[PDB]
Write an enzyme that holds these catalytic residues in place. Structure first.
Site, PDB file in Angstrom:
ATOM      1  CB  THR A 133      -0.971  -0.016   1.234  1.00 36.91           C
ATOM      2  OG1 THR A 133      -1.880  -1.118   1.059  1.00 36.91           O
ATOM      3  CG2 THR A 133      -1.752   1.266   1.396  1.00 36.91           C
ATOM      4  CB  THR A 134       3.905   2.131   1.964  1.00 34.88           C
ATOM      5  OG1 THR A 134       3.252   1.955   3.224  1.00 34.88           O
ATOM      6  CG2 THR A 134       4.874   3.302   2.047  1.00 34.88           C
ATOM      7  CG  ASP A 173      -6.342  -5.583   2.140  1.00 30.22           C
ATOM      8  OD1 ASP A 173      -6.208  -6.567   1.392  1.00 30.22           O
ATOM      9  OD2 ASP A 173      -5.607  -5.383   3.121  1.00 30.22           O
TER      10      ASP A 173
END
Ligand SMILES: NC(=O)c1ccc[n+]([C@@H]2O[C@H](CO)[C@@H](O)[C@H]2O)c1
Length: 189
Positions: free
Chosen positions: A22-23, A41
């Protein structure tokens, strides 16, 4: 002239749990123009639709746990928006789809213009996983009893994959990973 507006560039970022997907997506997005991110997600089913195995482990780390039809609909909504994102007068809109379970979903097997896959070994993955809180939380023994065996299943599912994946060392720093991917990606755009 061939009319513009219909082209897109779609990047897949998958990888094991807690590997920085995600980062990475967000860091890329900060450095790419007209770039959106969809996260897998966001498409988990409600817990009542999630099955439990013999040993009482909830089956979250499998495609059956995700509303992938809903995720496809979200991709399609981005594509529609993307077609109007550049005023007529090529600047190709970018989507990054990031999630732990993307590259075994066959309806999407031809969507990926670039594919990255973040990897971390068992020990460090387990450590990092213990630092995060899920809803519901990881039961005792959940990493060994479900998360890792399902990851190994996914990696074996990818053994016969029909496109190229770039595998990344998720133990590298966030900046290191960003620069590695950005360096690759800007040659693919
Ligand atoms: N997002 C959720 O509702 C949820 C619930 C239970 C477990 N998980 C974990 O999320 C990871 C994907 O990032 C998987 O390894 C799931 O175990 C997510």
């Amino acid at each position: 002239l061939v009319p513009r507006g219909s082209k897109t560039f779609i990047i897949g970022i998958s990888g094991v749990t807690n590997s920085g997907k995600t980062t990475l997506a967000k860091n890329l997005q900060k450095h790419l123009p007209n770039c959106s991110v969809i996260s897998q997600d966001d498409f988990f089913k409600p817990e009542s639709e999630i099955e439990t195995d013999k040993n009482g482990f909830l089956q979250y780390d499998v495609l059956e746990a995700l509303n992938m039809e809903k995720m496809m609909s979200a991709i399609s909504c981005w594509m529609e928006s993307a077609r109007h994102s550049v005023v007529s007068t090529e600047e190709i809109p970018i989507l990054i789809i990031e999630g732990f379970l993307l590259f075994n979903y066959k309806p999407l097997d031809t969507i990926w213009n670039r594919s990255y896959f973040l990897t971390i070994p068992y020990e460090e993955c387990k450590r990092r996983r213990s630092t995060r809180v899920y809803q519901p939380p990881d039961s005792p023994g959940y990493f060994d009893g479900h998360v890792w065996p399902m990851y190994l299943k996914y990696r074996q599912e990818m053994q016969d994959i029909t496109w190229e994946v770039v595998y990344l060392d998720g133990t590298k720093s966030e900046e290191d990973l960003f620069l590695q991917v950005y360096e690759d990606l800007i040659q693919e755009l």
